[PDB]
Amino acid sequence: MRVLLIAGGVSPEHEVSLLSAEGVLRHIPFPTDLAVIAQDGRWLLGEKALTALEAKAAPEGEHPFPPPLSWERYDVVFPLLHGRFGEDGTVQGFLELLGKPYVGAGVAASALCMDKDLSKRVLAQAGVPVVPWVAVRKGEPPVVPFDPPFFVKPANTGSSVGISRVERFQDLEAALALAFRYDEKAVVEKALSPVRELEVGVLGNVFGEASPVGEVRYEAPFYDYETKYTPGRAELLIPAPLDPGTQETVQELALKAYKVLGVRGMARVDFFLAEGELYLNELNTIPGFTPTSMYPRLFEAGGVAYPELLRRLVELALTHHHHH
């Protein structure tokens, strides 16, 4: 049994992916090799991948895709990549062609959960409450059916990259131009203020089990890019202070969203809490995975130790590939 861990990625969440791989490597209970996708799109292997992990960044790689790995060495691949090309289904598609088991959601579930427009379409169709939104495509003029404040995002983004809070219609065009540097499609959502941000972990194939519910607090107006990964700037409350009926409704909707979207392996489901109004914000199929990230600490509070969590993710991938 040997696992291949792929980290880094060309996405704007590259350094975030390397921080998650350091924690995974220290505690994974399987013999594990590291592959690092550098920012330039080329791969680092062996010692050079380890050296990039210490340097916490990988601007330039050595091997172009596909890299000269013996894929039959590995029984499972752990795609620990955040953002574009990582959790949007593209790497998962390659691993499917390769006939190789891998941790996390499949091609369709990965792509769906990374698209903030299409995931909201499927979720709303299933009766899952989401924020009122509209899609905007490059070139086509925006037609927002509601009034500011807005949150303008690229449709496929992570770590709040490219997201603006817009207060007036005059500031919309600049928020659209920013968002379109990262995607051909943007979403314009109605802003919730004030908002409490709740996050819950799911584990399992399609029919998952939920962790305790946690909460994120911060000083900035919203959970922006600078706040997210600057250590200490964020604040994780586990478990979140909620009425028992609210906690259950959150775990409820997360498992329903998980099942409808056909998610595999894991996902951190994130919610908004207005006053008592719950909205499902997004699903993240490759959450941050440092020993102190929300997802591991949530299941830590649920009786699943970090090494045991990693063990169960790998076996879930083996179970789906060789039996489903």
Ligand X SMILES: Nc1ncnc2c1ncn2[C@@H]1O[C@H](COP(=O)(O)OP(=O)(O)O)[C@@H](O)[C@H]1O
Annotated binding site: 147-198, 270, 282, 284
**229 interacts with ligand X by CB under 6 A:** no
Residue type at 199 in one-letter notation = E
**89 interacts with its own copies by CB under 8 A:** yes
Give the shortest CB-35-to-its own copies separation in angstroms.
12
Quote the longest CA-to-CA distance of the chain.
57
Q: Which of 14, 82, 84, 153 is close enough to bind ligand X by CB under 6 A?
A: 153
Is 288 one of the catalytic residues?
yes
CB under 8 Å to 7, separation ≥6 — which residues? 17, 18, 20, 21, 34, 35, 36, 37, 53, 80, 81
**39 interacts with its own copies by CB under 8 A:** no
245: phi then psi, degrees, rounded to nearest 5: -70, -35
**12 interacts with ligand X by CB under 6 A:** no
Distances (CA, A) of 32 to 7, 70, 74, 78, 310: 12, 14, 9, 10, 12
Q: Which of 15, 27, 39, 94 is close enough to bind its own copies by CB under 8 A?
A: 94
| Cβ-closest position to ligand X | 223
Q: Which is nearer to Mg ion, 228 or 264 (CB)?
A: 228
- Backbone Cα Rg of the chain: 19
**284 interacts with K ion by CB under 5 A:** yes
**88 interacts with K ion by CB under 5 A:** no
Catalytic: which of 75, 87, 117, 282?
282
* Separation between Cα atoms, residue 314 and residue 30, nearest integer Å: 9
Q: Which is nearer to ligand X, 215 or 270 (CB)?
A: 270
Cis peptide leading into residue 194 (ω within 30°): yes
Site string for ligand X, 268-307 (x = CB under 6 A): --x-x--------xx-------------------------
Is 62 one of the catalytic residues?
no
H/E element, 97: helix 90-97
| Catalytically active residues, by annotation | 13, 159, 229, 268, 270, 282, 284, 288
